[PDB]
Amino acid sequence: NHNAQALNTLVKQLSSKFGAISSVLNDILSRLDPPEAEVQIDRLITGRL
Protein backbone atom coordinates (compact mmCIF):
# COMPACT_ATOMS: atom_id res chain seq x y z
CA ASN A 1 0.00 0.00 0.00
CA HIS A 2 2.81 2.43 0.81
CA ASN A 3 4.46 1.82 -2.56
CA ALA A 4 1.24 2.16 -4.55
CA GLN A 5 0.17 5.26 -2.62
CA ALA A 6 3.52 6.96 -3.19
CA LEU A 7 3.35 6.26 -6.93
CA ASN A 8 -0.24 7.53 -7.16
CA THR A 9 0.68 10.70 -5.27
CA LEU A 10 3.61 11.23 -7.64
CA VAL A 11 1.36 10.89 -10.70
CA LYS A 12 -1.23 13.28 -9.25
CA GLN A 13 1.39 16.04 -8.96
CA LEU A 14 1.35 16.54 -12.74
CA SER A 15 -2.18 17.98 -12.57
CA SER A 16 -1.10 20.93 -10.41
CA LYS A 17 -0.65 24.35 -11.98
CA PHE A 18 2.23 25.02 -9.57
CA GLY A 19 2.15 28.79 -9.98
CA ALA A 20 1.64 28.69 -13.76
CA ILE A 21 -1.42 29.51 -15.83
CA SER A 22 -1.95 25.98 -17.17
CA SER A 23 -0.89 22.60 -15.80
CA VAL A 24 -0.56 21.06 -19.29
CA LEU A 25 2.66 21.91 -21.10
CA ASN A 26 1.31 21.63 -24.65
CA ASP A 27 -1.32 24.32 -24.06
CA ILE A 28 1.35 26.62 -22.62
CA LEU A 29 3.51 26.04 -25.69
CA SER A 30 0.67 26.59 -28.16
CA ARG A 31 -0.86 29.67 -26.48
CA LEU A 32 2.08 31.85 -25.50
CA ASP A 33 5.22 33.51 -26.87
CA PRO A 34 8.67 32.08 -26.03
CA PRO A 35 9.86 34.81 -23.61
CA GLU A 36 7.00 34.11 -21.18
CA ALA A 37 6.53 30.50 -22.23
CA GLU A 38 9.96 29.98 -20.68
CA VAL A 39 8.73 31.52 -17.43
CA GLN A 40 5.74 29.18 -17.34
CA ILE A 41 7.85 26.11 -18.12
CA ASP A 42 10.33 27.21 -15.45
CA ARG A 43 7.59 27.18 -12.82
CA LEU A 44 6.47 23.74 -14.00
CA ILE A 45 10.04 22.40 -14.18
CA THR A 46 11.07 23.52 -10.70
CA GLY A 47 7.84 22.26 -9.16
CA ARG A 48 8.12 18.87 -10.84
CA LEU A 49 11.77 18.61 -9.78
Binding site: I21, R31, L32
Partner: protein, 295 residues
Protein backbone atom coordinates in the same frame (compact mmCIF):
# COMPACT_ATOMS: atom_id res chain seq x y z
CA UNK B 1 20.52 1.50 -18.70
CA UNK B 2 21.22 4.08 -21.40
CA UNK B 3 18.13 5.71 -22.91
CA UNK B 4 14.37 5.42 -23.39
CA UNK B 5 12.89 4.16 -26.66
CA UNK B 6 9.73 5.78 -27.98
CA UNK B 7 8.02 5.55 -31.37
CA UNK B 8 7.62 8.94 -33.04
CA UNK B 9 4.31 10.06 -34.59
CA UNK B 10 4.12 9.36 -38.31
CA UNK B 11 2.03 12.36 -39.40
CA UNK B 12 -0.07 15.24 -38.08
CA UNK B 13 -3.86 15.42 -38.44
CA UNK B 14 -5.74 18.56 -37.40
CA UNK B 15 -9.46 18.33 -36.62
CA UNK B 16 -11.58 21.51 -36.62
CA UNK B 17 -15.25 22.45 -37.16
CA UNK B 18 -17.15 22.79 -40.37
CA UNK B 19 -19.49 25.74 -39.90
CA UNK B 20 -18.47 28.71 -42.05
CA UNK B 21 -19.43 32.24 -40.89
CA UNK B 22 -16.95 35.13 -41.10
CA UNK B 23 -16.78 36.61 -37.62
CA UNK B 24 -18.16 40.18 -37.40
CA UNK B 25 -15.05 41.79 -35.93
CA UNK B 26 -15.46 44.78 -38.26
CA UNK B 27 -18.56 45.87 -36.34
CA UNK B 28 -16.50 46.30 -33.18
CA UNK B 29 -13.39 47.57 -34.94
CA UNK B 30 -14.87 50.49 -36.88
CA UNK B 31 -17.67 51.43 -34.47
CA UNK B 32 -18.00 55.14 -35.21
CA UNK B 33 -19.25 55.98 -31.70
CA UNK B 34 -17.85 54.11 -28.72
CA UNK B 35 -19.39 53.66 -25.29
CA UNK B 36 -18.29 55.55 -22.20
CA UNK B 37 -16.02 53.90 -19.64
CA UNK B 38 -18.86 53.81 -17.10
CA UNK B 39 -21.43 52.63 -19.69
CA UNK B 40 -19.23 50.15 -21.55
CA UNK B 41 -20.94 48.00 -24.18
CA UNK B 42 -20.20 44.28 -24.35
CA UNK B 43 -20.84 42.11 -27.41
CA UNK B 44 -20.76 38.32 -27.45
CA UNK B 45 -19.10 36.40 -30.27
CA UNK B 46 -19.88 32.75 -30.93
CA UNK B 47 -20.33 30.28 -33.79
CA UNK B 48 -17.80 31.99 -36.05
CA UNK B 49 -14.33 31.48 -37.49
CA UNK B 50 -11.96 34.19 -36.25
CA UNK B 51 -9.10 35.46 -38.41
CA UNK B 52 -6.75 37.81 -36.55
CA UNK B 53 -4.31 38.28 -39.44
CA UNK B 54 -6.56 41.01 -40.84
CA UNK B 55 -6.21 42.86 -37.52
CA UNK B 56 -2.43 42.90 -38.00
CA UNK B 57 -2.74 43.75 -41.70
CA UNK B 58 -4.51 47.09 -41.16
CA UNK B 59 -3.75 48.42 -37.70
CA UNK B 60 -3.77 51.94 -36.22
CA UNK B 61 -3.40 50.46 -32.72
CA UNK B 62 -0.48 51.93 -30.79
CA UNK B 63 -0.90 49.53 -27.85
CA UNK B 64 -1.54 45.89 -28.79
CA UNK B 65 -0.63 43.86 -25.69
CA UNK B 66 -2.09 40.46 -24.81
CA UNK B 67 -1.91 38.92 -21.35
CA UNK B 68 -2.85 35.26 -21.71
CA UNK B 69 -2.38 34.51 -25.41
CA UNK B 70 0.40 35.09 -27.93
CA UNK B 71 -0.81 37.47 -30.68
CA UNK B 72 0.95 35.49 -33.42
CA UNK B 73 -0.55 32.20 -32.18
CA UNK B 74 -4.12 33.53 -32.33
CA UNK B 75 -5.14 31.69 -35.50
CA UNK B 76 -4.09 28.23 -34.27
CA UNK B 77 -6.44 28.00 -31.28
CA UNK B 78 -10.15 27.48 -30.62
CA UNK B 79 -12.00 29.69 -28.14
CA UNK B 80 -15.45 30.03 -26.62
CA UNK B 81 -17.19 32.35 -24.15
CA UNK B 82 -15.87 35.24 -26.24
CA UNK B 83 -16.83 38.85 -25.52
CA UNK B 84 -15.91 42.21 -27.05
CA UNK B 85 -16.12 45.22 -24.73
CA UNK B 86 -16.05 48.88 -25.73
CA UNK B 87 -15.06 52.13 -24.01
CA UNK B 88 -12.98 55.30 -24.43
CA UNK B 89 -10.52 56.49 -21.77
CA UNK B 90 -7.68 58.97 -21.34
CA UNK B 91 -4.23 58.50 -22.84
CA UNK B 92 -2.60 58.04 -19.44
CA UNK B 93 -5.26 55.55 -18.29
CA UNK B 94 -4.30 52.80 -20.75
CA UNK B 95 -1.92 51.42 -18.11
CA UNK B 96 -4.83 51.17 -15.67
CA UNK B 97 -6.56 48.75 -18.08
CA UNK B 98 -4.79 45.67 -16.72
CA UNK B 99 -5.33 43.05 -14.00
CA UNK B 100 -4.59 44.28 -10.50
CA UNK B 101 -4.16 47.93 -11.50
CA UNK B 102 -5.27 50.61 -9.03
CA UNK B 103 -7.08 53.52 -10.67
CA UNK B 104 -10.26 55.53 -10.38
CA UNK B 105 -11.65 54.07 -13.60
CA UNK B 106 -10.23 50.71 -12.54
CA UNK B 107 -11.96 50.77 -9.15
CA UNK B 108 -15.25 52.44 -10.11
CA UNK B 109 -15.62 52.02 -13.89
CA UNK B 110 -13.92 48.82 -15.09
CA UNK B 111 -12.41 45.98 -13.07
CA UNK B 112 -10.30 43.25 -14.66
CA UNK B 113 -9.77 39.97 -12.79
CA UNK B 114 -6.33 39.01 -11.52
CA UNK B 115 -6.47 35.83 -13.64
CA UNK B 116 -7.67 37.68 -16.74
CA UNK B 117 -6.67 36.21 -20.10
CA UNK B 118 -7.09 37.81 -23.50
CA UNK B 119 -5.94 40.74 -25.62
CA UNK B 120 -6.37 44.41 -24.73
CA UNK B 121 -6.00 46.94 -27.55
CA UNK B 122 -5.53 50.70 -27.38
CA UNK B 123 -5.26 53.35 -30.08
CA UNK B 124 -5.62 57.11 -30.35
CA UNK B 125 -9.01 58.62 -31.21
CA UNK B 126 -8.19 62.32 -31.49
CA UNK B 127 -9.59 62.62 -35.02
CA UNK B 128 -12.97 61.03 -34.24
CA UNK B 129 -13.54 61.18 -30.46
CA UNK B 130 -12.35 64.76 -29.91
CA UNK B 131 -13.95 68.11 -30.68
CA UNK B 132 -12.46 71.63 -30.76
CA UNK B 133 -15.10 72.90 -28.31
CA UNK B 134 -14.64 69.85 -26.06
CA UNK B 135 -16.05 66.34 -26.47
CA UNK B 136 -18.00 65.68 -23.26
CA UNK B 137 -19.93 62.62 -24.49
CA UNK B 138 -17.65 60.33 -22.45
CA UNK B 139 -18.20 60.22 -18.68
CA UNK B 140 -16.45 58.30 -15.91
CA UNK B 141 -17.56 57.15 -12.46
CA UNK B 142 -15.26 59.02 -10.08
CA UNK B 143 -17.08 58.31 -6.80
CA UNK B 144 -18.45 54.97 -5.64
CA UNK B 145 -18.93 53.39 -2.23
CA UNK B 146 -17.04 50.19 -3.08
CA UNK B 147 -14.82 48.93 -5.87
CA UNK B 148 -16.64 47.17 -8.69
CA UNK B 149 -16.41 43.48 -9.46
CA UNK B 150 -14.59 42.29 -12.60
CA UNK B 151 -16.68 42.57 -15.77
CA UNK B 152 -19.36 44.55 -13.91
CA UNK B 153 -21.14 47.65 -15.22
CA UNK B 154 -22.42 50.46 -13.00
CA UNK B 155 -25.10 52.59 -14.67
CA UNK B 156 -27.06 53.90 -11.65
CA UNK B 157 -26.98 57.70 -11.82
CA UNK B 158 -27.53 58.35 -8.12
CA UNK B 159 -26.55 61.99 -7.51
CA UNK B 160 -23.48 61.76 -5.27
CA UNK B 161 -23.02 63.89 -2.16
CA UNK B 162 -19.35 64.84 -2.59
CA UNK B 163 -18.94 66.07 0.96
CA UNK B 164 -21.01 66.64 4.09
CA UNK B 165 -23.72 68.73 2.38
CA UNK B 166 -26.83 66.73 1.39
CA UNK B 167 -28.13 67.28 -2.13
CA UNK B 168 -31.80 67.04 -1.05
CA UNK B 169 -32.68 66.64 -4.72
CA UNK B 170 -30.68 69.78 -5.59
CA UNK B 171 -27.22 69.18 -7.02
CA UNK B 172 -24.85 71.86 -5.79
CA UNK B 173 -22.27 72.44 -3.05
CA UNK B 174 -20.57 69.11 -2.27
CA UNK B 175 -23.14 67.37 -4.50
CA UNK B 176 -21.96 66.32 -7.96
CA UNK B 177 -23.00 63.28 -9.95
CA UNK B 178 -20.57 60.32 -9.77
CA UNK B 179 -20.17 60.69 -13.55
CA UNK B 180 -17.93 63.47 -14.86
CA UNK B 181 -17.44 64.28 -18.54
CA UNK B 182 -13.99 64.19 -20.09
CA UNK B 183 -12.69 67.46 -21.48
CA UNK B 184 -11.31 66.02 -24.71
CA UNK B 185 -9.76 68.59 -27.05
CA UNK B 186 -7.48 68.13 -30.08
CA UNK B 187 -5.03 70.77 -28.80
CA UNK B 188 -3.96 68.58 -25.87
CA UNK B 189 -0.86 66.46 -26.34
CA UNK B 190 -0.28 62.78 -25.73
CA UNK B 191 -1.46 61.42 -22.39
CA UNK B 192 -4.71 63.42 -22.42
CA UNK B 193 -6.06 62.78 -25.92
CA UNK B 194 -8.96 60.31 -26.15
CA UNK B 195 -7.95 56.68 -26.62
CA UNK B 196 -10.15 53.84 -27.87
CA UNK B 197 -9.73 50.59 -25.93
CA UNK B 198 -11.20 47.19 -26.83
CA UNK B 199 -10.58 44.04 -24.78
CA UNK B 200 -11.02 40.55 -26.22
CA UNK B 201 -11.92 38.06 -23.50
CA UNK B 202 -11.46 34.60 -25.03
CA UNK B 203 -11.91 31.88 -22.41
CA UNK B 204 -9.53 29.08 -23.37
CA UNK B 205 -10.11 25.56 -22.05
CA UNK B 206 -9.40 21.98 -23.11
CA UNK B 207 -12.69 21.28 -24.87
CA UNK B 208 -14.34 21.35 -28.32
CA UNK B 209 -15.57 24.95 -27.76
CA UNK B 210 -17.26 26.98 -30.52
CA UNK B 211 -15.00 29.65 -32.02
CA UNK B 212 -12.03 28.40 -34.03
CA UNK B 213 -9.26 29.65 -36.27
CA UNK B 214 -8.91 29.40 -40.04
CA UNK B 215 -7.06 26.06 -39.82
CA UNK B 216 -8.38 23.57 -42.36
CA UNK B 217 -9.70 20.12 -41.47
CA UNK B 218 -7.85 16.92 -42.33
CA UNK B 219 -9.00 13.31 -42.53
CA UNK B 220 -8.73 10.94 -39.57
CA UNK B 221 -6.59 7.80 -39.28
CA UNK B 222 -6.77 4.75 -37.04
CA UNK B 223 -4.25 2.51 -35.28
CA UNK B 224 -1.26 4.72 -36.04
CA UNK B 225 0.91 6.85 -33.77
CA UNK B 226 -0.13 10.34 -34.86
CA UNK B 227 0.07 13.79 -33.34
CA UNK B 228 -3.43 15.25 -33.42
CA UNK B 229 -5.12 18.60 -32.82
CA UNK B 230 -8.74 18.75 -31.64
CA UNK B 231 -10.01 22.30 -31.11
CA UNK B 232 -6.69 23.58 -29.78
CA UNK B 233 -5.63 20.45 -27.86
CA UNK B 234 -2.35 19.03 -29.17
CA UNK B 235 -1.34 15.51 -28.24
CA UNK B 236 0.55 12.47 -29.48
CA UNK B 237 -1.33 9.20 -29.28
CA UNK B 238 -2.89 6.39 -31.26
CA UNK B 239 -6.52 6.68 -32.34
CA UNK B 240 -8.70 3.61 -31.79
CA UNK B 241 -12.39 2.76 -31.74
CA UNK B 242 -14.46 3.23 -28.59
CA UNK B 243 -16.81 1.07 -26.56
CA UNK B 244 -17.31 3.77 -23.91
CA UNK B 245 -20.87 5.09 -23.69
CA UNK B 246 -20.45 8.85 -23.94
CA UNK B 247 -23.33 11.01 -22.75
CA UNK B 248 -24.70 13.39 -25.41
CA UNK B 249 -23.98 16.54 -23.39
CA UNK B 250 -20.53 15.07 -22.65
CA UNK B 251 -17.69 15.70 -25.10
CA UNK B 252 -14.39 14.69 -23.45
CA UNK B 253 -13.52 11.76 -21.22
CA UNK B 254 -11.04 11.48 -18.38
CA UNK B 255 -9.55 8.45 -16.62
CA UNK B 256 -8.54 7.90 -12.98
CA UNK B 257 -5.63 10.33 -13.35
CA UNK B 258 -7.86 12.92 -15.07
CA UNK B 259 -6.29 12.37 -18.50
CA UNK B 260 -8.12 12.56 -21.82
CA UNK B 261 -8.92 9.01 -22.89
CA UNK B 262 -11.92 9.48 -25.21
CA UNK B 263 -12.88 12.39 -27.45
CA UNK B 264 -15.93 13.27 -29.57
CA UNK B 265 -14.70 15.07 -32.71
CA UNK B 266 -16.77 18.21 -33.37
CA UNK B 267 -16.91 17.72 -37.14
CA UNK B 268 -17.87 14.03 -36.85
CA UNK B 269 -19.65 12.84 -33.70
CA UNK B 270 -17.70 9.70 -32.82
CA UNK B 271 -15.73 8.64 -29.75
CA UNK B 272 -12.01 8.00 -30.28
CA UNK B 273 -9.75 6.68 -27.53
CA UNK B 274 -6.44 8.38 -26.76
CA UNK B 275 -3.63 5.89 -26.11
CA UNK B 276 -0.06 7.26 -26.11
CA UNK B 277 2.37 5.47 -28.40
CA UNK B 278 4.44 2.61 -27.03
CA UNK B 279 7.61 3.45 -25.11
CA UNK B 280 10.02 1.80 -22.72
CA UNK B 281 13.50 1.92 -21.31
CA UNK B 282 16.44 0.46 -23.20
CA UNK B 283 19.12 -1.57 -21.41
CA UNK B 284 22.31 -2.75 -23.10
CA UNK B 285 23.76 -6.13 -22.11
CA UNK B 286 27.48 -6.34 -22.82
CA UNK B 287 30.52 -8.22 -21.53
CA UNK B 288 33.79 -6.45 -20.88
CA UNK B 289 35.08 -4.49 -23.86
CA UNK B 290 38.43 -6.23 -23.37
CA UNK B 291 36.78 -9.62 -23.89
CA UNK B 292 34.60 -8.61 -26.84
CA UNK B 293 32.57 -5.79 -28.39
CA UNK B 294 29.25 -7.54 -29.07
CA UNK B 295 26.15 -6.14 -27.36
Amino acid sequence: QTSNFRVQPTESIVRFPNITNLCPFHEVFNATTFASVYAWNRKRISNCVADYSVIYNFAPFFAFKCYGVSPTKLNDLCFTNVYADSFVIRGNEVSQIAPGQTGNIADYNYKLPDDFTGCVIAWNSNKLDSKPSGNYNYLYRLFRKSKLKPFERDISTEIYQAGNKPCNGVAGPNCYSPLQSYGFRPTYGVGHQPYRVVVLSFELLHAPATVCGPKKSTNLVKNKCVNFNFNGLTGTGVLTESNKKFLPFQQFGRDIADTTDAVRDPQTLEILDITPCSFGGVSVITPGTNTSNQV
